[PDB]
């Protein structure tokens, strides 16, 4: 294909990063992907007429801040900041992940999208308004998703590609 994109999915354990990744790639809901396994996948898609090679890093594993991990994260071109709408802690952690991205990217303008996952669940504890206000403060889009139903999944990843395109033309 034509353009390759290095996307990175970050967020607390259990918010659905693996399930979102497998949905995009396989169009199936995996309800228990090994929570410790970090891996990357490829999706070849046409987005707005451009053939796109999406490399998606589904982050997982031990929390560690070695120079080596910083450099691996530094290679990502755009990030999904994922929380789960039924998990306030995962939303409170969003600040941490945004700041780690900025730290290793050494920049305040990195392509990012805010993702509220598990939108199918009725047990909401994070208001849609709160997430919109945060994403507005960050200057990034906000997409509600459900890896279970595939709601918003294509929109989230494709919006991230569009944010990378915008960044490149700045
Ligand atoms: C006590 N912690 C601090 C406040 C909340 C809580 C957990 O925060 C958390 N947890 C992780 N793990 C938790 C256990 N399983 C999954 C991995 C992380 C893994 N790697 C990186 C990471 C490392 C280095 C550079 C990055 C540059 C960009 C992006 C990332 Cl994501 C980066 C982290 F920052 C992680 N932060
Ligand atoms: N109802 C619902 N459950 C989900 C959704 N996404 C993930 N899960 C479930 O939430 C748990 C965490 O999923 P995982 O994909 O393993 O989260 P990660 O730890 O961020 O990779 C698993 O039991 C998944 O089946 C979603 O959109 N809706
Ligand atoms: Mg996982």
Curated annotation (Swiss-Prot):
Q: Which GO terms describe its biological process?
A: actin cytoskeleton organization; cardiac muscle cell proliferation; cytokine-mediated signaling pathway; epithelial tube branching involved in lung morphogenesis; female pregnancy; forebrain astrocyte development; gene expression; glial cell proliferation
- The UniProt record gives the binding positions of GTP as 11-19, 30-36, 60-61, 117-120
Q: Provide the primary localization.
A: membrane
Glycosylated at which positions? 36
Enzyme Commission numbers on file: 3.6.5.2
Report the CDD domains cross-referenced here.
Answer: H_N_K_Ras_like
Q: What disease is recorded for this protein?
A: Leukemia, acute myelogenous: A subtype of acute leukemia, a cancer of the white blood cells. AML is a malignant disease of bone marrow characterized by maturational arrest of hematopoietic precursors at an early stage of development. Clonal expansion of myeloid blasts occurs in bone marrow, blood, and other tissue. Myelogenous leukemias develop from changes in cells that normally produce neutrophils, basophils, eosinophils and monocytes.
Name assigned to this protein: GTPase KRas
Q: Which gene encodes it?
A: KRAS
């Amino acid at each position: 294909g034509m353009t390759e994109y290095k996307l990175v999915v970050v967020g607390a354990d259990g918010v659905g990063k693996s399930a979102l990744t497998i949905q995009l790639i396989q169009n199936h809901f995996v309800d228990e992907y090994d929570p410790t396994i970090e891996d990357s996948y490829r999706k070849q898609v046409v987005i707005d007429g451009e053939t796109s090679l999406l490399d998606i890093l589904d982050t997982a594993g031990q929390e560690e801040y070695s120079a080596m991990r910083d450099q691996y994260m530094r290679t990502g071109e755009g990030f999904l900041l994922v929380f789960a709408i039924n998990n306030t802690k995962s939303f409170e952690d969003i600040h941490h992940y945004r700041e780690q991205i900025k730290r290793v990217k050494d920049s305040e303008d990195v392509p990012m999208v805010l993702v509220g996952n598990k939108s199918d669940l009725p047990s909401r504890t994070v208001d849609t308004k709160q997430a919109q206000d945060l994403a507005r403060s960050y200057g990034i889009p906000f997409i509600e998703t459900s890896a279970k139903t595939r709601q918003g999944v294509d929109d989230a990843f494709y919006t991230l590609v569009r944010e990378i395109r915008k960044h490149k033309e700045k």
